[PDB]
Structures are given as C-alpha cells and as structure tokens.
C-alpha cells in the first residue's frame, strides 16, 4: 500500500560532481528506509541501511540522509564505478514492501548530435514475409530522444544501447513494422526524428523509382 | 567467497508449474531470513516473497494465492514454488538474504535468475565512409552476440537490445560501419544452433 | 448467516473533529446537527446518530 | 561604531542543500565573531562562537569560516530543524557591539502563484466613516508581493504569514484604510498587486458596498 | 536542567519607569557575566547593557543616561531598571548569559520578554468554492489566537498577524474556504474579558 516517489529517471552529472538522489514516501515511515545500487551488468547491492547506517565496504563518498517522508542519497565525489541505476525501499510496513522507480546516473558531456541514417531492408526480406523499414540514430549523448514513424509522410518499439565510455553518447535504433512486402506497396515511407540541437526531420523518407 | 547460487528459471507454458532453486554458501543459513524479489526487462526491484527462521511465510498482493516459498535448515536449499504462471510475470528474480537487525533489508544478493512465461518456441531468425545494417527478425534469446564478415568483425559492430514481437520472438538491428571512399553480416544462434548470415553495402 | 441483518452491526460517521488513536464512543442518543437539535431527539435536521 | 554586513535578508534553499551564509565588517576584526540560530517562535541560540569553534550541542553540518572582514557560516546538508533566521555578531569592540540585520532560510519550490481574491467587510464598519477593503494574496511561494492601494483607480500597512510546512508558500493581506469622510466622499477602489507569474495586474477596481 | 527566567515586561507610560527581572537556574550565577539584548519586532538583535562578575556595568550608545542593570550574587537575581521610555524602546528583551573566554558571546538564552512603551489602552474589537473572512479593526496586543466555529471547523483557515494603528491600536484579518457549488468567526479578545463574533455566510 505504501508507495515511493524516487528522483527523475535519469540524473546526468559528471565525475567527482555531487549528486543528491531524492525519494520522498507517501506517509511518515521515520528511518525504515534502505537504498541500493544495480548496475545493468550485475546483480544489486546494498550501499544505505536504515537511511543512517552505511554498508560495510561502502566508500566514504557516499552519504544517506532524509527521513520520515523525504529521503536524500547524497553522493560527494563520483567516480567511475559510482555510475548505475539506485532504488530506495520502505521497511516500515515489512509484509508490503514496496520500490521506488529508480533513478539513472549518466556521465555529463557537450550536446552530440546523432548520426541519422536510414537503410532500406534487403531482397531477403522482401522474399521472406512481413518487411519492415529501419531508422538509426547512432552515437548521441542527448538520450531524451525518441523516434516514431508515419506513413508515406504499425510502428514498432524503439532500442538504445549503453552510454559507450568511447564518446559518452547513446546510440537509438527504431523500425516500423507493415504486412508481406509492403515496401513497394508505398513510394514513401517516413522516419519521425527528433533530437536537441538537430533540425528533429518529422518525415524522414526514402525516394523509390 | 560468501555467494548464493540460483537455477531453475527458464521457459514455461502459462500456468504450467515451476520450481526455483537457491543454494547459499559462506555464513550460517539457518540463523538468516531469505527473501524473493523479481525485477521486470525495463523495471525496478519487486517484492515476491520470503520466509524467516521460524519456517513463516510471506507473499505480495498480485502473489499470494500461486506462489509457494520453502527452505530447508540443512543442505543450505532455498527454493520457491511457482503455479498459474501469466505472461505479466516474467521478471528476473533475485535470491536474497535478509540481514540481522528489525527491520527488512538486503545485505546479500545472489546471482539472480530470469523466468520467462510465453507460450512461443525457439524459431531461426532470418539475415536482412558509410553506416548500414542488418535487421533480424524472428530471434529468441541467445547467449551469443551478432559479428560481421562471416565473424572476423567485431570491434565496430553495435547490437541493440532486442524487442518482443507479437509472434513470442525478437528482433535485432545490429550495424556496422565500412569504408565507402559490403561484408557479410553473420548472425548466430546457440539455441538454435544454426548459424544464418547476409549482407549489406553503402 | 442472516439473510436479513438490518442490524446487531453499526458504524460512526461524524464527529471527524480529532478522534483520538484508540479512543471509542459509545452516546449516540443525540448530538449537535442541524439549526436546532430537534429538543433532543431524533428526527429530520437531526440525523447525528450513527 | 563597528557595522556589519550580512547576506541577503532571505535565501532560499531545498533540504540537503549547501548554504554558504555570508557575513561581512566594517574592518580587521581578526576571529571575535560569532554566529546565532533564531527560530521565530523561540528564543535565539548560538552555533558557532569565535568563528572556529563549534557550540556543544550543534551538530556537525554547520561550519563557520572566514575572518578578519569576511565571514562565511557554510552548511553541508539542510533538515527540517535548520530553516530559521541568522544573525552575526562581531566582538572585537566588546561594548559596542554589533549584530547583523539577519538572513532567513525557507524552503525552495515552484514559484506559486498568489489566488488574488477581494471581499467587502460586513456593514459593521460601513456604519462608522472608517470603512476599508482588503486584498488578499495567498498561498503564494514568495514573499517579495508589492502591494499598494489607487484611490479612484488610503493605502495602509500589509500582513504576512508564515511560511507553511507542507504547501511552502505565503498568505499576504492587504487593507484600504479610509478616513473620516472618504469612505463617503470616493466610491470606486481599486487593488494594486505586482508579482511574478501575473500579467502586471496594477489596477484591480472594487465599488464600495 | 539549565535556564533563565524572566518577568516584569508589560505596557508602560512613556518616560515611565520600569524593572525588568531575570533569575538563573542550573549552574554557578556568581561566576559568569550577564548581557541584556533586546530585538524591535521586525528588527534584529541589539545588545542594550551588561554587567561583569566584579559589578561593572556597560551600557549602549542610545542606552547609557536612562538605563541602570544591577545584579546580586545571590537568589541568582538579575535585574534591569528603565526611566524615560519613549516609543522608539518598543522591543522584545531577552536574558543572556556570558560563557568563558576571553570575548563576549552569548551561550545561553533565557525566555525572552516583551516590553511596549505606548500612552494607548485595551479597547474592545470590531469583527466585521469561494475564500472570505472576517476583518477585526481597534484591536489591542493578545495572549490567544483567533479561530473559527470554536476551533472544530477542519476547513481552511489561517489568521495573519496584526498591523499597527494611530491611535496604537491594532487590526487584525482572518480567511476561511466556505463551500460555494456560513461559519462563524470567533474573536475571543483576553486582555478586554470580551468576546465578538461574526459569520460570513454568502
């Protein structure tokens, strides 16, 4: 029945930057209160224990606060392996036990804008059955983006990978979906583009003979 | 080291029967509470059940009714017993041991386990300065990732995660870039164990 | 197993004022409600029982 | 004969914030300087004496710094207990000693936009030849809300709650006073309000009851 | 425990003379030096006079002439006696106590008390979806809050603090939230031993 209301989904700040991430309860819970930290390639760990206490093998940069209805995971200097995705969980009432949404820490860099390209699909999927029609927004660091479709000016869902430690960017891959061959059922089919400090093209398409 | 095992998750019918499996190691389990939490492809941590010293047990709301927790004092075996499975539970799920104090927090995790309810099979996907790539269709989940020129290309080739279509299968829309101033895109499949490839050029 | 009830279970629904953790009310023959408290006694403008 | 200089009369700030509270002299007086914690509904107390040394009792998040002429009282992480006003103190000149206009510290928000609501009193006072209107501003983030009177479109003092401790906005009130006979002389009125987030609303007209 | 009592504040004659009084409680009186700081309201603080261990006595710029502190070493008695008030003296005094060291600072505070230089008396107050509420003019200095409907009403309510009058009186203004898809406002004035009320039903 309790519910957690954490910080925004994503929290874009630098290394050695102090980071304060806040999640407030929806009642007065006192300090019944934990964190922890997920990174997407291993499994969760505990840093914050009772919203006082700190984790045994914690580095001393991190720091708990808040308590009764807001909570405040304080972060003084980030490093490299501080970056991952946290939660705070309510023990005041230990049957229901409930999570917060969670929240993202992503390394902050200059505004990259992606690398749009567009590919038809090959003769194969054309002899194969239901085609499809792919765009690419490669090596962005504004991830805020989002790519939809339209026809001739069933869409399918969106692919981001990792932030690559090479660049600080994000790469986003979205495709539209139609029926058997219907590649050349139109003459035009539109990519809908939209990134910060890009021109955002609404209808992204290709020109058939 | 102090770890805790897991196996059992994998492919099920929906509401077919299952049973996970948890083995700790390192510390003294008879004197620790363990706790079951899942964790939705895109989602946060959920609470599903757990069991204290005492052998009481403990479920959530959407939990109660299907799921059935056990542990036994020896041989250091956790286990958790899953019925009436649905496709709105398919979620990694986390061995947990609950720590010593009064209230209920997470000081050891283990490995982790995924279960995934669909009733679908493993089908084989289909192959479909310049930047291009291959679209896959029809895939499953596979321990392996995507390589180019029939698997000598590696270094500059992205995979994005893949997506869920309605047929119970997945989709990949790995790329590469090659100089334009045109390799064959090799895609393969462990659980399939067939090996399928194309190519594309600027 | 009374298909009928009607009674022997009854609940408050006034008096939100303070209503103190733990501290229960029985007097329930009449209360404040109304312009005029009906001279104490049940009625219409007087509906303060439970 | 010794001034002091402190920071702005308010600051604004969000809990686990840092606040560096400024404190500036007339002149070289070396550390004979202290700080003091004033909550406006109790007596004040002191944090930080000889601008070194910390109060027993206090606890560590607050810090005092600087010297001679310049003083800064910085704090690590704001709690609910820590928004109050401040004063500096110097005692370099014992006798004549000096304190700090004061710096208050509320709690940050969106800036709230005040409910502009106007209503004639009874006629109670309309009876009398001292009639008035009132103007009222409330649950507003801040405090800064100009209000003035326009006759034909007098003016009088306002008045200003506290800040709330869950809607963290301010309630203002505003009166027109009138005196003898210019209750029955004029007939139209009219509310001067200046704050942000409104459209200038300079002139808000009333008739008289 | 550790505290300092005051009394004697209250309304007073201009040029009147008045005695404060401050008695400690909880540690050595005879040993540490005693401050007097009063604060206009709206104002901050400002130090008025102290008196040292060895019975010297300092006062301020504006203070010296007209003030004379006094202290005995026993009863833990502090005391401080004004002549010749004005208005310009209207302000809340507080007692404080000097720690050791070798410069002035305040380390404990006592009550505080509130003294008025005004020639004015208590008189008797007027009280005259939507948001309304009851205007109360001639009002005076009050020990109680103004409340609505007794207090029992759970509806909006909020009262602002009072704003000064020429004749030194005071004015006082309260609001309520009133369905509007007719409570009444209790001004219980103490220092007249009156009550007044209104409603504001639309």
């Known amino acids: 029945d309790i519910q957690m209301t954490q910080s925004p989904s994503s929290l874009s700040a630098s290394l050695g930057d102090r980071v304060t991430i806040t999640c407030?309860?929806?009642?007065?819970?006192?300090?019944?209160?934990?964190?922890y930290q997920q990174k997407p390639g291993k499994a969760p760990k505990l840093?914050?224990?009772?919203?006082?206490?700190?984790?045994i093998g914690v580095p001393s940069r991190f720091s708990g606060s808040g308590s009764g209805t807001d909570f405040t995971l304080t972060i003084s200097s980030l490093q490299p392996e501080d970056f991952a995705t946290?939660?705070?969980?309510?023990?005041?009432?230990?049957?229901?036990?409930?999570?917060?949404?969670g929240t993202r820490l992503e390394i902050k860099r200059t505004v990259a804008a992606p690398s749009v390209f567009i590919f038809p699909p090959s003769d194969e999927q054309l002899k194969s059955g239901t085609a499809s029609v792919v765009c690419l927004l490669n090596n962005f660091y504004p991830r805020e983006a989002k790519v939809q479709w339209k026809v001739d000016n069933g869409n399918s869902q969106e692919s981001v990978t990792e932030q690559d430690s090479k660049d600080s960017t994000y790469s986003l891959s979205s495709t539209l979906t139609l029926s058997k061959a219907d590649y050349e059922k139109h003459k035009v089919y539109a990519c809908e583009v939209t990134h910060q400090g890009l021109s955002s093209p609404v209808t992204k398409s290709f020109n058939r003979g | 080291e102090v770890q805790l095992a897991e196996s059992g998750g994998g492919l099920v019918q929906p509401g077919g029967s299952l049973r996970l499996s948890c083995?700790?190691?390192?510390?003294?389990?008879?004197?620790?509470?363990?706790?079951?939490v899942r964790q939705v492809t895109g989602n946060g941590l959920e609470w599903?059940?757990?069991?204290?010293?005492?052998?009481?047990?403990?479920?959530?709301d959407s939990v109660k009714g299907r799921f059935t927790v056990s542990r036994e004092n020896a041989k250091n075996a956790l286990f958790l017993q899953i019925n009436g499975l649905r496709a709105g539970d398919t979620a990694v799920?986390?061995?947990?041991?609950?720590?010593?104090?009064?209230?209920?927090?997470?000081?050891?995790?283990?490995?982790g386990t995924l279960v995934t309810v669909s009733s679908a099979s493993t089908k084989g996907p289909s192959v479909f300065t310049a930047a291009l790539g291959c679209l896959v269709k029809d895939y499953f989940p596979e321990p392996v990732t995507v390589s180019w020129n029939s698997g000598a290309l590696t270094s500059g080739v992205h995979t994005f995660p893949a997506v869920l279509q309605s047929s119970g299968l997945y989709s990949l829309s790995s790329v590469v870039t090659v100089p334009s101033s045109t390799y064959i895109c090799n895609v393969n499949h462990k659980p399939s164990n067939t090996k399928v490839d194309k190519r594309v050029e600027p | 197993s009374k298909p009928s009830g009607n009674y022997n279970y009854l609940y408050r629904l006034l008096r939100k004022s303070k209503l103190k953790p733990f501290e229960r009310d029985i007097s329930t023959e009449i209360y404040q409600a109304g312009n005029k408290p009906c001279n104490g006694v049940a009625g219409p403008n007087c509906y303060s029982p439970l | 004969d010794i001034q002091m200089t402190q920071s702005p009369s308010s600051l604004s700030a969000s809990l686990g914030d840092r606040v560096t509270i400024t404190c500036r002299a007339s002149?070289?007086?070396?550390?004979?300087l202290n700080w003091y914690q004033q909550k406006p509904g109790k007596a004040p107390k002191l944090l930080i004496y000889?601008?070194?040394s910390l109060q027993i009792g206090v606890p560590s998040r607050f810090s005092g710094s600087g010297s001679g002429t310049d003083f800064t009282l910085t704090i690590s992480s704001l709690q609910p207990e820590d928004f109050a006003t401040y004063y500096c103190?110097?005692?370099?000149?014992?006798?004549?000693?000096?304190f700090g206009q004061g710096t208050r510290l509320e709690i940050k928000r969106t800036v709230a936009a005040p409910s502009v609501f106007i209503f004639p009193p009874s006629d109670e006072q309309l009876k009398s030849g001292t009639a008035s209107v009132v103007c009222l501003l409330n649950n507003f983030y801040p405090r800064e809300a100009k209000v003035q009177w326009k006759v034909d479109n007098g003016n009088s003092q306002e008045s200003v709650t506290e800040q709330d401790s869950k809607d963290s906005t301010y309630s203002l009130s505003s009166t027109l006073t009138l005196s003898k006979a210019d209750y029955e002389k004029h007939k139209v009125y009219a509310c001067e309000v200046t704050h942000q987030g409104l459209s200038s609303p300079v002139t808000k007209s009333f008739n008289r009851g | 425990e550790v505290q300092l009592a005051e009394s004697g504040g209250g309304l007073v004659q201009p040029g009147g003379s008045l005695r404060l009084s401050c008695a400690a409680s909880?540690?050595?009186?005879?040993?540490?030096?005693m401050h007097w700081v009063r604060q206009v309201t709206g104002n901050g603080l400002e130090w008025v006079s102290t008196?040292?261990?060895?019975?010297?006595?300092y006062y301020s710029d504006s203070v010296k002439g007209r003030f004379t502190v006094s202290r005995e070493n026993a009863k833990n008695a502090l005391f401080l006696q004004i002549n010749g008030l004005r208005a310009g003296d209207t302000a809340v005094y507080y007692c404080?106590?000097?720690?050791?060291?070798?410069?002035?600072?305040?380390?404990?505070w006592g009550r505080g008390t509130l003294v008025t230089v005004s020639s004015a008396s208590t008189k008797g107050p007027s009280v005259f979806t939507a948001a309304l509420g009851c205007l109360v003019k001639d009002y005076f200095p009050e020990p109680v809050t103004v409340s609505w409907n007794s207090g029992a009403l759970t509806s909006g309510v909020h009262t602002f603090p009072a704003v000064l009058q020429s004749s030194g009186l005071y004015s006082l203004s309260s609001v309520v939230t009133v369905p509007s898809s007719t409570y009444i406002c209790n001004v219980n004035h103490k220092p007249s031993n009156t009550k007044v009320d209104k409603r504001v039903e639309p």
């Open positions: 404080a106590r000097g720690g050791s060291g070798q410069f002035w600072y305040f380390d404990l």
């Open positions: 909880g540690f050595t009186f005879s040993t540490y030096d």
């Open positions: 008196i040292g261990t060895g019975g010297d006595t």
């Open positions: 002149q070289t007086i070396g550390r004979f």
């Open positions: 000889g601008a070194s």
């Open positions: 103190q110097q005692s370099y000149s014992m006798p004549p000693v000096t």
